[PDB]
Amino acid sequence: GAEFLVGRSGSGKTKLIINSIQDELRRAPFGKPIIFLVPDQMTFLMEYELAKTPDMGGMIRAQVFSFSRLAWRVLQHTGGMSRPFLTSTGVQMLLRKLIEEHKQEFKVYQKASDKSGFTAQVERMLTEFKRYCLEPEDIRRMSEYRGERVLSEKLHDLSILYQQMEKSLADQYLHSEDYLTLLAEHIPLAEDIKGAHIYVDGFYQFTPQEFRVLEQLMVHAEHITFSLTADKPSYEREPHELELFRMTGKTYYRLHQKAKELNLDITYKELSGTERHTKTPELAHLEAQYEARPAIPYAEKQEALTVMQAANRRAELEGIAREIHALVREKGYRYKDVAILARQPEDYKDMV
């Protein structure tokens, strides 16, 4: 069965999940497996948080997994982990090799086949194909369109390289983006999944390759909860282009329609009130009135929200440094309480 846990940012979805897993750990320390599925950047975080119970101070029944980790586990029990692993660079190397003997068959990328940047581009493309479940046959298969001629030339060349790669790797090697597909086809045969409870949270969207795994878990696991950051999403239709929760909305729509497609018992939980910004009016106002047009102005006092203008990135970082000092020296915070985010970290990394 499935449970769709949905709410806006600050609703309490994550904490709710943590508390559920913790209670479940208290009730049956050696019960059926508990799988916490999160993005890689979130794994350690959740491990820590689950380990912070005065009650227990750790876990055994419950484990935290990324798609990659999950694949590694299930494959280490069901098989398929034995065959060699290829890095992205290794694949690039193979691709270059294939280019050197298939360049004369190309229709468009013959001249470009000379350059080392081209092999990287092809690597990126083929990886994307595998992530969106498109075997070389489907590439070969591929509303009148102006660029159709060139596109078909490209796809033609790509199909040559792709099929040649799959041929060279067959019965010998494992592409980097094959773990998830191999995982999808060993989940039915895996005993640990069969009684397991699964929570998935942190994801905004899924690659088709990841969806395959998700629906397999929908089938062979006991229950699975999908935690999405959105506001009352529709199963009836995908979100509008300009909608705030476009991505997570679409994720909800697809996940739900596949839960329905497999006749699962579904449970809806909607988190309404804020928990994060309970004590901070400005941040709750910002969180709620973000999308709103026209936006209602905040009428109260300024304290917890500051827009800052720096003379340059050097000034920006030093200013923030001073502020952080103030926060840990006067306002009683600790360094771990602070977060610094940049859309383009490369602009700040060294200077930071």
Binding site: L25, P29, F30, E47, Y48, L50, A51, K52, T53, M56, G57, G58, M59, I60, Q63, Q76, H77, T78, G79, G80, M81, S82, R83, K336
Partner: protein, 138 residues
């Protein structure tokens, strides 16, 4: 072993590097027999344990976050006497007081993990060495 070779759970070179006698001998042992005859059994047990930083480091603080210690327990089985822990080692032997201290803190970590998280006591620990089929208890 062969099934593990056809499931690709074990490579060909991995398959051929097996001393079948050495592993079969384990099931002729006392701890092995007690393993076969247990209320409940489990293998490859993953665990995370939260130890307050002061225990590993002097000068830590009660406020300061615990450190997270992580590992995998080889085997755990339960009889009418209690819960026992089992681990396998391919350590070179053919030595007991040395191996005892070599893995002592590790075993203590495992036991403390089971005791704290499972809220259950652990009576007796066992380490089986493939070389000569030795078994030492802690």
């Amino acid at each position: 072993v062969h099934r593990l070779y056809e499931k690709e759970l074990l490579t060909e070179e991995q398959k051929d590097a097996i001393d079948i006698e050495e592993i079969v001998q384990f099931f002729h042992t006392e701890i092995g027999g007690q393993l076969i005859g247990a209320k409940w059994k489990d293998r490859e047990i993953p665990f995370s344990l939260a130890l307050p930083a002061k225990e590993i480091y002097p000068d830590a603080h009660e406020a300061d976050e615990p450190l997270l210690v992580q590992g995998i327990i080889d085997c755990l089985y339960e009889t009418e006497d209690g819960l026992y822990l089992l681990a396998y080692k391919s350590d070179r032997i053919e030595a007991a007081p040395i191996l005892k201290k070599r893995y002592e803190t590790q075993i203590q970590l495992y036991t403390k993990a089971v005791e704290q998280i499972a809220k259950t006591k652990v009576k007796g620990c066992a380490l089986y060495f493939f070389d000569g089929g030795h078994i030492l208890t802690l």
